[PDB]
Amino acid sequence: GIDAVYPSLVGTADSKAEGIKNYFKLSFTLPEEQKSRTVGSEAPLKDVAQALSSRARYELFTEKETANPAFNGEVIKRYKELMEHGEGIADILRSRLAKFLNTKDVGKRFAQGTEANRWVGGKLLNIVEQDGDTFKYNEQLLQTAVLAGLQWRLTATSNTAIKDAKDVAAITGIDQALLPEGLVEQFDTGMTLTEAVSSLAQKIESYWGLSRNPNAPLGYTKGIPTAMAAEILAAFVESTDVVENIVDMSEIDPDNKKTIGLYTITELDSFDPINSFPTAIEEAVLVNPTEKMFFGDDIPPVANTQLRNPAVRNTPEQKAALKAEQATEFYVHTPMVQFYETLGKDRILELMGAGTLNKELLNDNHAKSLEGKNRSVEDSYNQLFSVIEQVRAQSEDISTVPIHYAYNMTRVGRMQMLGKYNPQSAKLVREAILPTKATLDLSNQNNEDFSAFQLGLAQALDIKVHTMTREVMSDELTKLLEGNLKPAIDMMVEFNTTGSLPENAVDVLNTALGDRKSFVALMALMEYSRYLVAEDKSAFVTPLYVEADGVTNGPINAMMLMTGGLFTPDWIRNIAKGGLFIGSPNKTMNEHRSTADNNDLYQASTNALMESLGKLRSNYASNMPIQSQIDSLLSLMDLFLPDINLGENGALELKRGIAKNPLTITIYGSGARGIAGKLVSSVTDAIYERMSDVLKARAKDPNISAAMAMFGKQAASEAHAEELLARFLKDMETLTSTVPVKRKGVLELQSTGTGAKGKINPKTYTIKGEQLKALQENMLHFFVEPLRNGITQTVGESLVYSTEQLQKATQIQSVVLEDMFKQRVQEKLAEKAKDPTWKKGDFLTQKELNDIQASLNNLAPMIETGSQTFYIAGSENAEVANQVLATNLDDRMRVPMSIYAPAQAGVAGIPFMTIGTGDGMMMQTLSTMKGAPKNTLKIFDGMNIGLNDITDASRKANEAVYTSWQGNPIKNVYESYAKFMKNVDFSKLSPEALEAIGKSALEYDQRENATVDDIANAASLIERNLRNIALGVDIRHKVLDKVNLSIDQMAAVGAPYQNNGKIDLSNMTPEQQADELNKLFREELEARKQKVA
DNA sequence: GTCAAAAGTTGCGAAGCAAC
């Protein structure tokens, strides 16, 4: 079969043969249904170039009566030129092989019998053919691979994952908190070796259109396509389509010996015709294209498995959710596109980015940051217009072309739109391509339609709409429209009248908006002006939306989902800050914030921090050095952060802002040190930025004083700015030269020796490593520690207990799964080493890996909720195989063999379950529930709704919230841990693993002497803890359901969901309600106790 | 120990350790 297709490849298609064995024929087979149209083609490049030569030929090739109308004259011309470039890449590959065969006589040794086709660096030899005294590439395989490379080169960058600080930390091996400014930026734009080859190889294999032999070693089924990809990347480096940069980590800190390769694809002109249709090759080669836009009723297919978790199938309910979201039609909002176009890329960067950089009128590290910002915006802008260019081809009126987006379920249950820059992920794109739309009657400002319009405009303009009633926000909005924004509104009225903008459009927008500036704010100015010049106000069509947005969503979800003790009055008061109102029929968040409690969860946490800080000050009331250090940290923060304020007489004011990120990531399992690093980071960014201000402050007046050049605005007078500068220098000095240390359970100050001082140079000023670390230690002990105490005090110690038990159970289970998998692999390999047809380098077959995974099912690797599936340990790492998979023909680009297998979970269990059974379950329900809202854009913890359906959609969202609050993630974990506990055998664990388990199940002093029996006993203890927690959560949810509740967690609109519970708890204090609820709790405890018969 | 996906390069010589 396959031999008939590739009859001339070198070697025998029999793993038993004694001579050269061809592992390409042994590893792959032809599918029972064609996947690639090039299979059988003698000259794929020639044949595909032919297909791309005219619309008529493309239609014949793809056996379709119609071709994407974007495939026009100019596009066809570009693809003809791109095909000629494919011949160049093909030519470079041919010379590289010849060079490889000539070097150290590999070709001669291979012809003589040496099995070089089994070397990790010679796997490509499996796709060559004898040619006279040498070997040559099989043209069909080589040319198809090139076609894969061309498509990859055109769209890979638009499908790369975004890299955050943590990612860069993992890659570079540098502490996330001590990363040098710009590093994350440099790494987020380029691709690591693994990233590049992996995506390239995946693409090559799909284009070869064959199927893997389940009984063939991974060293070939995966290694040959990877070997081909490595060569193609090498070819692209020679052609300059890709730039390789090897970043030496030692340059940043001499201990780090890692040299990391980065690959950046050369960008095509933003105006290149190819951008309007960058997927012609993919749609021509594949019978079922992956990359393509979905227009009209061309709908994306539904993914069968969870993203990057092959072993996890999307449940029926998750698939229904994905189908529902992919069904939604998005439409281009022409006015906004025209606005972006008129402004221009240069002015959008100036308005929403860093504008033009004068890399000498701003601090070096600041500039690196600004440059990072412009990039994100510029890339979003080019991406939107590439899409617009293809949409415009679909018809005369671009605003009528329906667009669909593909989604998939992530590891944590979130429905993620696929692609780097889309409406769900990119703010700029979000205001140009929308699914929201409504025709409103705005002829009378007393209409319900006009109220909705106002709500959308207000929210977009940064008015806190969920903190006040509709009537009150209407007045706030009116004030802004008739005041500060008035000049911008006039400019937009003129734009919507003549289509022209002033030369100072950026300045008018900037001044009018102030800190309200955002893309959605531009949409509000755009839409309000359009209504003003509107002909028929009785039927105003607008995509303006209102986002029903969760109020402290993650933290509140965790509180409802994992608090398992009796009800307390503090919890009742705090949970109300998240929209769960007890005994207050039809109460909304708007009313709550304006009449009952103006502090949300962030503020309450901050207020707890303040109290915990005072407590810390007392414990060291006599220690002047300690007090002075605390004063310096607050002084430094008050100097650059807006959320920290210090009055004239010393009064400390802390705004909810400082607790936002910290509370959020604390619910995602973050440690205290990470929070400290981020807090320091925001401080330093402000400093670097202040330095830049000086540079220009002095360029304007070479006589301006340093004090006034650095604090000239933030102060009242000169002697006043002079004392601000005194605070700065002193603070930086004490915070970098002295750090707090935990000795004997007490705080003691230590000299670092690496103090910071000297005449500052606002051009090169840079807080070094040791100094950022000193700053971090001070931040940790004098600010983050008490913040953590306040947070715990706010969300409840019961919740913290649950999350720790959850973390322990899932870590323990992940450690076992990881170790057992590794062991079964070593056992199998040892067994293969006795097989003569097998060789080291080859690995296990896919079937063998499958068997090993299956042997772990009794340890319950998956957590099931009944509508979602979570696999916490699931991952892909190079540690299982611990070997190279393939290299390029120059012996470089050595791609490690990565394998899908369980790995230690760390704290991931908390985020997985919180995010998954919280917002993830809620959105899933909202997409599939009876009367599920249509035409919305869901963004995990918020949903954009069209102005015509804000009331019902918001109510449905709140009902969806209530539905997810019926979940019990701890019970789900318990049922998994329970099966695991009865089948596990800790004795079969490596000492390395057993130790990790002891850290989770025993208290630090019991680890050293801990016997298998000891940890095994402790592990079973955790199981009982989980059972008891699950039982309480379950009871609480049933009890709460009997009471009258009003839920408005997805706030803004003021349409709370009523559970209509019968037990009336109105006219009762939180203490009274807690007592009544606990009575119901105890009642059920007895009922579900002895009587369930 | 923040989730969303992983994660160093290269000579010698043909695996996998040494040097950076």
From Swiss-Prot:
Residues the record lists as binding Mg(2+): D549, D941
Function: DNA-dependent RNA polymerase, which is injected into the host upon infection and transcribes the phage early genes from promoters that have a 5-bp stem-3 nt loop hairpin structure.
Family: Belongs to the phage and mitochondrial RNA polymerase family.
Source organism (scientific name): Enterobacteria phage N4 (Bacteriophage N4)
Residues of the full protein shown: 1008 to 2100 of 3500
Subcellular location: Virion
Binding site for ATP: K427, L428, V429, R430, D549, G550, V551, T552, N553, G554, K660, N661
Description of its domains: Contains three functional domains; the central domain possesses the transcriptional activity.
Coiled coil: 1071-1093
Name of the protein in question: Virion DNA-directed RNA polymerase
